[PDB]
């Protein structure tokens, strides 16, 4: 399957993708103000994620850091990245199907669109103003949005027991993005589509 990445944000982002013990393709790229990367994900790949990383600093050698989805200071992600980061989260060819979702559970940095390029479902956003009316106790430093498991480190947060409930923090994103997961057990978002659909992740969808 194709991913084309843009970044139609009017700041550089470091995409990566990964599927949390691999990179994706080449794992992570630096991505100017309207930059496209076209990346390849083998057929059955499950748990398959796409992000953007702010304000990184990588030398000769692809290694550095951001101030938000950092993998282990990689230019190419093989691992997932620190919060807070808008997911896309992708699983191909499951009997058949594709299933495609954006998730705020680990938080937002940057808004996205995920859509299919091919046919027969259709796209999900988050690009909402997430930072600018991100809850004074969720907010990253570094920029961006913190999820309250990341931040508090209760069960409740972070579902540990695999009961909960939403919250006024998971409300928040939930308000903001009502397509994106909010927390763990939030009724899901995912999209059906097709097996061996090709995708389209957009960075900054609307501004």
């Known amino acids: 399957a194709t991913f084309e990445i843009v970044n139609r944000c009017s700041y550089t982002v470091w995409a990566a993708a990964s599927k949390g013990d691999a990179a994706l393709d080449a794992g992570g790229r630096q991505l100017n103000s309207g930059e496209s990367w076209t990346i390849n994900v083998e057929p059955g790949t499950n748990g398959g994620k796409i992000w953007a990383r702010t304000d990184c600093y990588f030398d000769d050698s692809g290694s550095g850091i951001c101030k938000t989805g950092d993998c282990g200071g990689l230019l190419r992600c ?29 938080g937002f940095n940057v808004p996205m669109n995920f859509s299919p390029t091919t046919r027969g479902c259709r796209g999900v956003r988050c690009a909402a103003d997430i930072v600018g009316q991100c809850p004074a106790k969720l907010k990253a430093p ?31 994103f939930k308000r903001l993005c009502p397509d994106a997961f909010s927390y763990v057990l939030d009724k899901p978002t995912t999209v059906t589509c097709p097996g061996s659909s090709n995708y389209r992740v957009t960075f900054c969808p609307t501004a």
Do not use: H, M, W
């Open 78 to 106: 093989k691992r997932f990245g620190r919060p807070p980061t808008t997911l896309a989260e992708f699983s191909l060819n499951q009997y058949g199907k594709d299933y495609i979702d954006i998730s705020n559970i680990k």
């Open 142 to 172: 570094g920029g961006g949005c913190n999820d309250a498991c990341t931040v508090f480190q209760t069960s409740e947060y972070c579902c540990t027991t695999g009961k909960c409930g939403p919250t006024e923090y998971s409300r928040f």
